[PDB]
């Protein structure tokens, strides 16, 4: 089974200077929370430890981007980090990351706010991203797929129930994943330049995710 109730539980259970330093700081901090969040997802812990690692290494960037995007829907022209510091449009632009920051605001944060995406819908979307069968190295790509399918079956149902008014609400949720994939890649690239130039402190767990497959 794949109950939408326990997915939201996973989301609830994990609720709590220089923009870039704060960003690297908050990303390392949230990586611990992501592990705990992942374990509270149905059928996840019952996957072989090696594939749990592969999925978490494949999706961590998009999973964290989704979280702070939804977290910032009640914020004007800026994002709320997990450390508790706000990063606004000007501060990010003055840091040299205004472009990718703007994409997050328009393609993600604003779109979430304007459809009033709830924590259940956010939860399912992050579960769909976590259960990525395209991930290379999986011992059982078919089973991950089986789990993803059961996530968006439960999500479509919840939508048609909770929002019977909106018949395309289910499709609108899934069609944010392309932008999320796109934004994740660009954010990741920004993260790599930081590490390479190495003038920004990068703590150990974040450092571990940025190193070779």
């Amino acid at each position: 089974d794949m109950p939408v109730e326990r997915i939201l539980e996973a989301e609830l259970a994990v609720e709590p200077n220089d923009p870039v330093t704060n960003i690297c700081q908050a990303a390392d901090k949230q990586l611990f929370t992501l592990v705990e969040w992942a374990k509270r997802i149905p059928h996840f812990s019952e996957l072989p430890l090696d594939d749990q690692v592969i999925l978490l290494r494949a999706g961590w960037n998009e999973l964290l981007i989704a979280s702070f995007s939804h977290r910032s829907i009640a914020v004007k022209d800026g994002i709320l980090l997990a450390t508790g510091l706000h990063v606004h449009r000007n501060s990010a632009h003055s840091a040299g990351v205004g472009a990718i920051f703007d994409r997050v605001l328009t393609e993600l944060v604003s779109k979430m706010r304007d459809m009033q995406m709830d924590k259940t819908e956010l939860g399912c979307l992050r579960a769909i991203v976590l259960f990525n069968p395209d991930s290379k190295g999986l011992s059982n790509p078919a089973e991950v797929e089986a789990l993803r399918e059961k996530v968006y079956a439960s999500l479509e149902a919840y939508c048609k129930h909770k929002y019977p008014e909106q018949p395309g609400r289910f499709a609108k949720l899934l069609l944010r994943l392309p932008a999320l994939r796109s934004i994740g890649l660009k954010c990741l690239e920004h993260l790599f330049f930081f590490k390479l130039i190495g003038d920004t402190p990068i703590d150990t767990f974040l450092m571990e995710m940025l190193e070779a497959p």
Binding site: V35, L49, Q52, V53, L56, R57, T204, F205, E208
Partner: peptide, 10 residues
């Protein structure tokens, strides 16, 4: 590799 493996083992 290990920080992730540890945390998943609980």
């Amino acid at each position: 590799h290990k920080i992730l493996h540890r945390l998943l083992q609980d």
